[PDB]
Every structure is written in structure tokens, then in C-alpha cells.
């Protein structure tokens, strides 16, 4: 309930208001992704997760609850993701890479050679449900 004393990260400072700096960045992201063509994989994912996070930031007033339900970093690590997605949208718009070439071809190699168990392997835990919901949205 109380304001966050420290974020635990050097350079990252606690933002006194995080439900008002995120509800605005998400609104800007949703109002600026419109320039991307509708049938592009980027727009669908960036307009799916930005809608869910925007709804979550609208439902619950306290930052602790927002941290709990999203479960992906602190509210001070979500502002720095929204501000980077906003920059990425502009860079996509000015570059305009949306044109699929007529002579496009991609070699999708699929190797299956196993690796040992003691070998260092990056094994993360299950991602939040949205990372899969956006995925089914993209495939569909």
C-alpha cells in the first residue's frame, strides 16, 4: 500500500505514480500502432499485450496488485518497456519494412542433434499467460 522505498536496481528510480504513467504510454502505443498495416504480425502482438496491460492498469488502483497479476517485473520495469515500444513503433513506421518481396525465400533449417545434460542450457520458467495468448493470436 505504501510507496515503494527502493527498486533494488541502480539507475532505476521509483516512480511515485505508476498507474498514471503506464495508462498513458499504453494509450499512446494503441493510438500509434494504427499506422502499421492490419495484417502484420507486429501490429497484432503489440496491440494484444498493450491492451491487456492497459486493462490491468485500469482495473486495480495499487501498484502491488498490478505487479502481482502481470507478474513480469516491477512497475518501473514496465514503464521502460512501454517507452521502448513507443520508440520501436516510430522506427518501424519510418523504415516501413512491411513490404513482402515477390522473390522472398527463407531456408528454415531444423536440426535435432541432442546435447548433453551437464552442458549449460538456458532453462527459464513458464512465461505469463499473455506471452502465449499473443502467440495464438499471431498464428490465428
Amino acid at each position: 500500500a505504501k510507496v515503494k522505498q527502493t527498486t533494488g536496481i541502480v539507475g532505476l528510480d521509483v516512480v511515485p505514480n505508476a498507474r498514471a504513467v503506464l495508462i498513458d504510454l499504453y494509450s499512446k502505443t494503441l493510438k500509434e500502432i494504427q499506422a502499421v498495416p492490419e495484417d502484420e504480425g507486429y501490429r497484432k502482438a503489440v496491440e494484444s499485450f498493450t491492451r491487456q496491460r492497459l486493462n490491468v492498469c485500469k482495473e486495480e488502483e495499487d501498484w502491488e496488485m498490478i505487479e502481482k497479476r502481470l507478474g513480469c517485473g516491477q512497475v518501473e520495469e514496465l514503464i521502460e518497456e512501454a517507452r521502448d515500444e513507443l520508440t520501436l513503433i516510430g522506427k518501424m513506421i519510418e523504415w516501413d519494412p512491411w513490404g513482402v518481396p515477390d522473390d522472398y525465400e527463407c531456408e528454415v533449417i531444423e536440426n535435432d542433434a541432442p546435447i548433453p545434460k551437464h552442458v549449460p542450457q538456458h532453462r527459464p520458467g513458464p512465461l505469463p499467460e499473455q506471452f502465449y495468448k499473443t502467440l495464438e493470436g499471431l498464428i490465428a
Partner: peptide, 10 residues
């Protein structure tokens, strides 16, 4: 190896 090649596919 499964080196199939993608195409524009209209």
C-alpha cells in the same frame, strides 16, 4: 536435416 525452403506463396 529438415532444410525446407519458404516461399511467398501468393
Amino acid at each position: 536435416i529438415r532444410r525446407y525452403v519458404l516461399t511467398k506463396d501468393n
